[PDB]
Amino acid sequence: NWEHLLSLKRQGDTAKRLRIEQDDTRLGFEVDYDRIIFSAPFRSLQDKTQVIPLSKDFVHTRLTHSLEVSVVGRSLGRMVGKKLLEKYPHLEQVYGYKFNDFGAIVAAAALAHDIGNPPFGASGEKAIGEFFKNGYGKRYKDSLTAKEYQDLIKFEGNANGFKVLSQSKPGAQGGLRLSYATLGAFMKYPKESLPHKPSDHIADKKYGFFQSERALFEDVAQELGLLKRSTTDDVSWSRHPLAYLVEAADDICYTIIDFEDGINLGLIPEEYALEYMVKLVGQTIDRNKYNALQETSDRVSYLRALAIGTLINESVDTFMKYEEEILAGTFDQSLIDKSNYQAQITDIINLSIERIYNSREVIEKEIAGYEILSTLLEARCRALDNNDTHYNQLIQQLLAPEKSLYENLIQICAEVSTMTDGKALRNYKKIKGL
Amino acid sequence: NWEHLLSLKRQGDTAKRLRIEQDDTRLGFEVDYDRIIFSAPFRSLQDKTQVIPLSKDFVHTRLTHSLEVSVVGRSLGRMVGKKLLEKYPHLEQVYGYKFNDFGAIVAAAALAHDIGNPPFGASGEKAIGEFFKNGYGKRYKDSLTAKEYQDLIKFEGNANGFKVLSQSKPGAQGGLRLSYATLGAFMKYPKESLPHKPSDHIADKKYGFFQSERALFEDVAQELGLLKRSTTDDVSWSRHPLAYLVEAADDICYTIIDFEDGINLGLIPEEYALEYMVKLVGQTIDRNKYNALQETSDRVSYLRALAIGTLINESVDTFMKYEEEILAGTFDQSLIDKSNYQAQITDIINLSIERIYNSREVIEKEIAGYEILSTLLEARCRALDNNDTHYNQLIQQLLAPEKSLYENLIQICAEVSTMTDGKALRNYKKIKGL
Ligand SMILES: Nc1nc2c(ncn2[C@H]2C[C@H](O)[C@@H](COP(=O)(O)OP(=O)(O)OP(=O)(O)O)O2)c(=O)[nH]1
Ligand SMILES: Nc1nc2c(ncn2[C@H]2C[C@H](O)[C@@H](COP(=O)(O)OP(=O)(O)OP(=O)(O)O)O2)c(=O)[nH]1
Ligand SMILES: Nc1ncnc2c1ncn2[C@H]1C[C@H](O)[C@@H](COP(=O)(O)OP(=O)(O)OP(=O)(O)O)O1
Ligand SMILES: Nc1ncnc2c1ncn2[C@H]1C[C@H](O)[C@@H](COP(=O)(O)OP(=O)(O)OP(=O)(O)O)O1
Ligand SMILES: [Mg+2]
Ligand SMILES: [Mg+2]
Ligand SMILES: [Mg+2]
Ligand SMILES: [Mg+2]
Numbered sequence: 001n002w003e004h005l006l007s008l009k010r011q012g013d014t015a016k017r018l019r020i021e022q023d024d025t026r027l028g029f030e031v032d033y034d035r036i037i038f039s040a041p042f043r044s045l046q047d048k049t050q051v052i053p054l055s056k057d058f059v060h061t062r063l064t065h066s067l068e069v070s071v072v073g074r075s076l077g078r079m080v081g082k083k084l085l086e087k088y089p090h091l092e093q094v095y096g097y098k099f100n101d102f103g104a105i106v107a108a109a110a111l112a113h114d115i116g117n118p119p120f121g122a123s124g125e126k127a128i129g130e131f132f133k134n135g136y137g138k139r140y141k142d143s144l145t146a147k148e149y150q151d152l153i154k155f156e157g158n159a160n161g162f163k164v165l166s167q168s169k170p171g172a173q174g175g176l177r178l179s180y181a182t183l184g185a186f187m188k189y190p191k192e193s194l195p196h197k198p199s200d201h202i203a204d205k206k207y208g209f210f211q212s213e214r215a216l217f218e219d220v221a222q223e224l225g226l227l228k229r230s231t232t233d234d235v236s237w238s239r240h241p242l243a244y245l246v247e248a249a250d251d252i253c254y255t256i257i258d259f260e261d262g263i264n265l266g267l268i269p270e271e272y273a274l275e276y277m278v279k280l281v282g283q284t285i286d287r288n289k290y291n292a293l294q295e296t297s298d299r300v301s302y303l304r305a306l307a308i309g310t311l312i313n314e315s316v317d318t319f320m321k322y323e324e325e326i327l328a329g330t331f332d333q334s335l336i337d338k339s340n341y342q343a344q345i346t347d348i349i350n351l352s353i354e355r356i357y358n359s360r361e362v363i364e365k366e367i368a369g370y371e372i373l374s375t376l377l378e379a380r381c382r383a384l385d386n387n388d389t390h391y392n393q394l395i396q397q398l399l400a401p402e403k404s405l406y407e408n409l410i411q412i413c414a415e416v417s418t419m420t421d422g423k424a425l426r427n428y429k430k431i432k433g434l
Numbered sequence: 435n436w437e438h439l440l441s442l443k444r445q446g447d448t449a450k451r452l453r454i455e456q457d458d459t460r461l462g463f464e465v466d467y468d469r470i471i472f473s474a475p476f477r478s479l480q481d482k483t484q485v486i487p488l489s490k491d492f493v494h495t496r497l498t499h500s501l502e503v504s505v506v507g508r509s510l511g512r513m514v515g516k517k518l519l520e521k522y523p524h525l526e527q528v529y530g531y532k533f534n535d536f537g538a539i540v541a542a543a544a545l546a547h548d549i550g551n552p553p554f555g556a557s558g559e560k561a562i563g564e565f566f567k568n569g570y571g572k573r574y575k576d577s578l579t580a581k582e583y584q585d586l587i588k589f590e591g592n593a594n595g596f597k598v599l600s601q602s603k604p605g606a607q608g609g610l611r612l613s614y615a616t617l618g619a620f621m622k623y624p625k626e627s628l629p630h631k632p633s634d635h636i637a638d639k640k641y642g643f644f645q646s647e648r649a650l651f652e653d654v655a656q657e658l659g660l661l662k663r664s665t666t667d668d669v670s671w672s673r674h675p676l677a678y679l680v681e682a683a684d685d686i687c688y689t690i691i692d693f694e695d696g697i698n699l700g701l702i703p704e705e706y707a708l709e710y711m712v713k714l715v716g717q718t719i720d721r722n723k724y725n726a727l728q729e730t731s732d733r734v735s736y737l738r739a740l741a742i743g744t745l746i747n748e749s750v751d752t753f754m755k756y757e758e759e760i761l762a763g764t765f766d767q768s769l770i771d772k773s774n775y776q777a778q779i780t781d782i783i784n785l786s787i788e789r790i791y792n793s794r795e796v797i798e799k800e801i802a803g804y805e806i807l808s809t810l811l812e813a814r815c816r817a818l819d820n821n822d823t824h825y826n827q828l829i830q831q832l833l834a835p836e837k838s839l840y841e842n843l844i845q846i847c848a849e850v851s852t853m854t855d856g857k858a859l860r861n862y863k864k865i866k867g868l
Contacts, residue, residue: 025512025533034505038739040731043498046480047490056481056490056856063497064477071468078459099459100534171726292605297474305472422490 002088003095004225005240006105006181011166011174011219020096029104032178036112039176041164045114047420049121051258051356053365054421059261062114065253069110072312073249077106079316080245087323102242108178109185109246116161118417119424120369127373128155128413136378140409147234148406150193151210152413158189159210160417163410166216184224184240188247190217191236201332203239210410227329238329248315248335256307259348260300262356270296273303276348280341281306314339372428373416379431380412399427436522437529438659439674440539440615445600445608445653454530463538466612470546473610475598479548481854483555485692485790487799488855493695496548499687503544506746507683511540513750514679521757536676542612543619543680550595552851553858554803561807562589562847570812574843581668582840584627585644586847592623593644594851597844600650618658618674622681624651625670635766637673644844661763672763682749682769690741693782694734696790704730707737710782714775715740748773806862807850813865814846833861 008017008028022028036042045063047056055061081102084091091097118124131137132152141149151159165183167175189208198204209217214235221237230236259276262268281303293299318335325331336345356362376399383395400415419427442451442462456462470476479497481490489495515536518525525531552558565571566586575583585593599617601609623642632638643651648669655671664670693710696702715737727733752769759765770779790796810833817829834849853861 025516026509037501037505040492043492043494046495046498058474058477060477061480064480067471071471075460082459169732170728171723172732289605294604298603298606 001225002084002091004223005184006097006101007179007223009180009223010177011216012177019101027101027104028179029101029108029182032108032176032182033104033111035176035178036108036115041115041418042112044418044420047422048117048119049124049421050254051121051261052362053120053123053369054425056422058264060257062117065257066111066114068253068257069113069246069249070107072253072308073106073110073246074103075312076245076249076315077103077242079312080319083316083320084323105181105185106242106245106249108182109242110249112161112165113186113246113250114157114161116159116164116417117157118155118160118373119419119421120366120373123366123369124373124417125155125157127370128377128416129153130370131374131377135374136381137409140405143405145211145406147192147194148211150196151207152409154193154196154207155413156206156208157417158206158208160414162187162209162217163213163414166213180220180223181240181242183220184226185242185246187217187220187240188243190221190226190239191230192234194234202334203236212407212410229329239326241323241326244319244326244331244335245315248319251334251336252308252311252315255345255348256304258352258356260304262352263300264297267355267359268351270299272351273300276344276351277303277307279344280310283310311336311339311341314341369421372424375428375431376416376424377412380416381409384408384412398430435659436518436525438657439618440531440535441613441657443614443657444611445650446611453535461535461538462613463535463542463616466542466610466616467538467545469610469612470542470549475549475852476546478852478854481856482551482553483558483855484688485555485695486796487554487557487803488859490856492698494691496551499691500545500548502687502691503547503680503683504541506687506742507540507544507680508537509746510679510683510749511537511676513746514753517750517754518757539615539619540676540679540683542616543676544683546595546599547620547680547684548591548595550593550598550851551591552589552594552807553853553855554800554807557800557803558807558851559589559591561804562811562850563587564804565808565811569808570815571843574839577839579645579840581626581628582645584630585641586843588627588630588641589847590640590642591851592640592642594848596621596643596651597647597848600647614654614657615674615676617654618660619676619680621651621654621674622677624655624660624673625664626668628668636768637670646841646844663763673760675757675760678753678760678765678769679749682753685768685770686742686745686749689779689782690738692786692790694738696786697734698731701789701793702785704733706785707734710778710785711737711741713778714744717744745770745773745775748775803855806858809862809865810850810858811846814850815843818842818846832864 006019008019008022010017010028017028042063045066046061048062049055050060050062050065052059078099081099084102085097085099118128120127129152132140132149132155137152140152144152162183165176165178165186169175187208189203189206191204191207192209192211192214193207218235221235224240226237226240228235228237259268259273263270263273284306290299290302293302315335318338319326322331322338336342339345379395380399383392383399386392403411416424440453442453442456444451444462451462476497479500480495482496483489484494484496484499486493512533515533518536519531519533552562554561563586566574566583566589571586574586578586596617599610599612599620603609621642623637623640625638625641626643626645626648627641652669655669658674660671660674662669662671693702693707697704697707718740724733724736727736749769752772753760756765756772770776773779813829814833817826817833820826837845850858
């Protein structure tokens with residue numbers, strides 16, 4: 001039920017924090033927002049790849065993408081919360097909740113939803129995985145549990161993001177110490193790395209936490225009241241209802257903005273821009289304003305602003321139509337896939353894949369990223385092995401100012417993923433002496 | 435009075451927008467926030483100098499600084515608005531205002547408060563001015579009005595920010611079309627470029643708009659009901675009350691974060707970090723937590739988080755103590771200057787000036803920036819003069835995809851200030867063929 005889903009608990013708490021005992025100027029979710037804003041992991045997003053590597057231009061990075069997702073998520077959360085308190089009046093009438101709380105939760109979750117991504121993006125994650133699969137790290141296969149090896153060979157940015165958010169350090173336990181509602185709404189694949197893709201459900205495409213933090217998530221999963229889907233030997237719970245909204249906001253934003261940026265770069269003609277969006281923007285377009293503009297940028301910006309407004313309302317309608325199934329855990333798709341504009345979205349995505357992801361420029365950067373990440377990971381792993389050599393001591397002093405082998409390897413992968421693109425490239429040249 | 439200060443009017447409006455007729459999910463100030471978030475001028479802040487040029491590291495840029503100022507400003511606005519509606523109940527009881535509106539106004543104003551700054555920062559502005567003062571642009575002195583020449587030789591980032599926010603383009607008038615309350619709260623020097631520093635008041639140190647937009651500000655200044663301070667031949671109004679809060683937030687944030695970054699870089703020892711902040715953090719510090727931490731970063735982050743919380747409350751107290759004078763226009767200082775911690779702030783600022791601004795690293799970058807900006811401005815100005823040469827046509831096609839001389843020169847200065855540091859450097863090398 002909804003009372004346990006909006007928990008204000010933080011790690012290490014003993015008492016019970018109640019909504020009616022909060023300070024209304026600064027609620028806990030706003031504190032979460034402010035704690036994410038002021039941290040270094042959030043700042044490192046400014047020079048991390050969204051689509052085009054090493055482009056910190058007029059193209060998007062992870063930071064600006066996260067900000068746009070935050071705005072869209074705040075809007076979605078406010079509408080859905082107003083409709084929910086309309087449906088269940090006891091929430092507001094007894095517990096003391098307002099529709100701004102839902103917006104704060106979704107905004108905070110959407111702000112930190114990519115905070116664990118490594119440099120170079122998808123190619124970076126695949127390179128980290130291939131290093132342990134077919135490279136040097138393969139030699140560790142026999143020393144590790146099967147699920148730990150699966151963690152290392154299918155490295156996921158979501159698990160690393162959870163690790164960053166809930167990291168324990170000497171003298172400061174809990175990390176950022178976010179609320180449990182925010183951690184639940186941030187969590188989109190509540191399962192371990194094995195088994196690999198059991199079903200066709202949407203919460204099974206990947207995994208969301210490592211083996212070193214499973215216990216932590218267990219605590220979270222038992223406070224919110226999430227339904228359990230497996231207890232044999234591998235735990236898996238159902239989604240928090242607001243993770244659907246977070247995912248919808250992320251999908252809308254990147255789907256539209258990638259097209260707009262590709263048009264502005266010179267890779268997609270504007271005829272496609274009008275053709276694939278006339279249906280989306282037809283219900284609110286004022287042709288006069290469209291015909292007055294004299295630049296491609298103004299036209300594409302107008303079209304994007306209209307399309308986002310249409311899609312947000314459609315998503316809210318879908319969520320309120322399937323609320324019961326979502327709360328019961330039986331809803332196996334995304335809110336976007338149940339929309340009237342699926343064909344247009346698929347056409348835009350296919351055009352983006354053909355014209356942007358496979359561009360020469362984009363390709364060369366990913367190959368360079370593969371080389372850089374492999375070099376840095378091999379250096380760290382060889383330093384971890386010997387430990388007695390002078391060279392090993394130098395590498396330790398440069399790249400790292402009692403734990404198990406799995407903990408050491410996962411820490412190595414986490415430290416590689418903190419770097420930006422430029423810092424990784426600079427370290428690569430310094431290692432090579434170039 | 436306060437009823438006219440919180441105006442929801444936009445440029446080109448004919449009717450009257452009322453607060454009670456708004457959609458509560460998305461008020462106008464949130465629309466302003468979202469319009470700033472999604473624009474290209476805001477995105478260009480990601481690679482612009484805050485203190486250390488060409489450092490897009492773990493140091494701050496203009497974008498992250500603006501986000502932190504937005505958080506602090508939202509908090510300040512919420513507290514001040516709650517106290518105001520406590521003082522004047524008729525606002526809420528009749529007009530229908532809530533204390534979140536003040537926070538939205540201050541957050542939107544603080545988000546765009548540096549949007550007109552050029553690359554390389556203060557050195558960049560001084561280079562643009564010196565170009566017209568002692569360089570090529572001096573030849574235009576005889577063709578321009580005195581106030582226009584003063585505009586060109588004392589180039590200000592605030593005037594350029596107003597120009598960016600309220601720019602008119604073919605087919606889209608008004609630019610971002612922000613609310614008038616937001617434009618007033620963004621405006622901190624409501625005067626022209628002449629006379630130069632008439633008095634010791636705080637609204638006279640600089641100027642806030644160009645001659646090409648004076649008329650525009652007049653409209654704004656007459657809708658809010660701002661008091662007039664000069665009508666002889668040069669217009670000058672008093673400050674919007676919330677500009678004080680915007681300035682306080684900006685001062686707090688940069689004053690603390692510059693010290694923290696200098697400590698993390700290796701230019702200031704940590705002994706000073708404890709010595710100059712023990713008084714600030716003494717009222718809420720838990721020594722146990724401070725002694726548990728084992729890294730400099732954790733300690734300085736803790737101290738910064740405590741200091742910001744102390745300063746915010748002190749600023750709110752000062753504002754509510756001098757509200758009457760501020761509303762009457764007789765308050766001639768800043769809220770920070772009337773605080774109990776002025777000595778500590780001055781010590782930290784002096785240490786920052788001695789240790790960070792005059793570092794070798796910082797110095798070399800500013801000299802390079804002077805060279806780059808002078809080259810680009812001279813190229814644009816020589817292209818504007820001749821117009822018939824083949825080279826001039828090439829420069830026009832590269833650097834610029836019926837107006838007066840002053841309009842052309844101010845547009846040149848505005849187009850130079852859109853570039854980031856990296857883009858300016860790349861264009862400089864391409865001009866030199868290197
Ligand atoms: N360059 C490049 N970019 C890609 C490729 N595949 C995806 N992208 C970029 C384009 C999208 O804007 C961006 C979205 O990345 P996400 O990790 O957020 O993807 P997704 O929504 O599938 O999220 P997920 O990790 O599955 O939850 O990734 C690729 O093969 N090459
Ligand atoms: N590198 C360098 N940075 C400087 C210098 N002077 C100021 N800064 C940097 C440090 C501060 O964090 C930052 C603040 O710039 P602002 O333009 O916001 O200054 P201010 O608050 O005086 O604002 P204003 O334009 O007068 O309203 O400028 C300087 O001489 N060199
Ligand atoms: N409903 C929404 N909620 C949140 N963000 C939105 C919404 N609609 C659009 N956005 C995003 C993308 C837009 O570029 C930006 C500004 O929105 P907005 O100013 O309402 O768009 P617009 O130009 O279509 O305006 P209007 O509807 O007044 O004509 O915010
Ligand atoms: N009152 C405030 N309003 C807005 N932002 C604030 C405030 N105080 C601090 N900040 C900024 C700077 C902090 O690094 C960041 C997070 O604040 P916060 O979590 O309250 O600080 P803290 O670590 O001192 O916590 P606490 O008071 O719970 O011990 O937000
Ligand atoms: Mg994302
Ligand atoms: Mg709209
Ligand atoms: Mg600033
Ligand atoms: Mg605090």
